[PDB]
């Protein structure tokens, strides 16, 4: 289940496949170097030039067959890129979250004035309006 183990067992499959091939390449190379020390009036320089010249003709039939393969492969990667874009959309689109409205206070004072006209000397004229009750000793 660990997506990591798979990627690991997948690489080992390539290292082994490459070994069988790399191990088969040195095998032929060994016998090839064996003829190197031995001269061969048959393989002359002019003969080598004609060899690479012939392999250049087949290389055309190969790139032609694979030429249609690389085109199809790139097409698969093309649709594989647009899909990866979805992941980018998430990185930019942060996981939305509906629950808060951020409203500390829209400065709901009560009027344009500082709303502090109240006088500390006596609130207003003289305490509540009442009916005088008592404030002057003499009749007036």
From Swiss-Prot:
Q: Which gene encodes it?
A: SNCA
Residues bearing Phosphoserine are 87, 129
Where, subcellularly, is it found? Answer: Cytoplasm; Membrane; Nucleus; Synapse
Entry note about domains: The 'non A-beta component of Alzheimer disease amyloid plaque' domain (NAC domain) is involved in fibrils formation. The middle hydrophobic region forms the core of the filaments. The C-terminus may regulate aggregation and determine the diameter of the filaments.
Region (4 X 11 AA tandem repeats of [EGS]-K-T-K-[EQ]-[GQ]-V-X(4)) residue ranges read 20-67
The alphabetized list of GO BP terms reads: adult locomotory behavior; amyloid fibril formation; behavioral response to cocaine; cellular response to copper ion; cellular response to epinephrine stimulus; cellular response to fibroblast growth factor stimulus; cellular response to oxidative stress; chemical synaptic transmission
- Expression (tissue specificity): Highly expressed in presynaptic terminals in the central nervous system. Expressed principally in brain.
Which spans does this entry mark as compositional bias, Acidic residues?
112-140
Query: What is known to happen upon mutating residue 2 to A?
Result: Impairs copper-binding
Task: List keywords of the entry alphabetically.
Answer: Acetylation, Alzheimer disease, Amyloid, Cell projection, Copper, Cytoplasm, Disease variant, Membrane, Metal-binding, Neurodegeneration, Nucleus, Parkinson disease, Parkinsonism, Phosphoprotein, Repeat, Secreted, Synapse, Ubl conjugation
Instruction: Specify whether Cytoplasm is a keyword of the entry.
Output: yes
Classification from the root reads: Eukaryota, Metazoa, Chordata, Craniata, Vertebrata
- Where would you say this protein principally sits, based on its record? cytoplasm
Q: What is the effect of changing residue 57 to K?
A: Increases oligomerization
Region Disordered: which residues? 100-140
InterPro entries, per database record: Synuclein, Synuclein_alpha
Question: What's the protein here called?
Answer: Alpha-synuclein
Sites binding Cu cation sit at 2, 50
Name the segments for region: Interaction with SERF1A.
111-140
Q: How is this protein annotated for GO cellular component?
A: actin cytoskeleton; axon; axon terminus; cell cortex; cytoplasm; cytosol; extracellular region; extracellular space
Q: Provide the assembly information.
A: Soluble monomer. Homotetramer. A dynamic intracellular population of tetramers and monomers coexists normally and the tetramer plays an essential role in maintaining homeostasis. Interacts with UCHL1. Interacts with phospholipase D and histones. Interacts (via N-terminus) with synphilin-1/SNCAIP; this interaction promotes formation of SNCA inclusions in the cytoplasm. Interacts with CALM1. Interacts with STXBP1; this interaction controls SNCA self-replicating aggregation. Interacts with SNARE components VAMP2 and SNAP25; these interactions allows SNARE complex assembly and integrity.
Organism of derivation: Homo sapiens (Human)
Whereabouts are the sequence repeats?
20-30, 31-41, 42-56, 57-67
> Phosphotyrosine occurs at which residues?
125
Write out the function statement from the record. Answer: Neuronal protein that plays several roles in synaptic activity such as regulation of synaptic vesicle trafficking and subsequent neurotransmitter release. Participates as a monomer in synaptic vesicle exocytosis by enhancing vesicle priming, fusion and dilation of exocytotic fusion pores. Mechanistically, acts by increasing local Ca(2+) release from microdomains which is essential for the enhancement of ATP-induced exocytosis.
Illness association: Genetic alterations of SNCA resulting in aberrant polymerization into fibrils, are associated with several neurodegenerative diseases (synucleinopathies). SNCA fibrillar aggregates represent the major non A-beta component of Alzheimer disease amyloid plaque, and a major component of Lewy body inclusions. They are also found within Lewy body (LB)-like intraneuronal inclusions, glial inclusions and axonal spheroids in neurodegeneration with brain iron accumulation type 1.
| PTM entry text | Phosphorylated, predominantly on serine residues. Phosphorylation by CK1 appears to occur on residues distinct from the residue phosphorylated by other kinases. Phosphorylation of Ser-129 is selective and extensive in synucleinopathy lesions. In vitro, phosphorylation at Ser-129 promoted insoluble fibril formation. Phosphorylated on Tyr-125 by a PTK2B-dependent pathway upon osmotic stress.
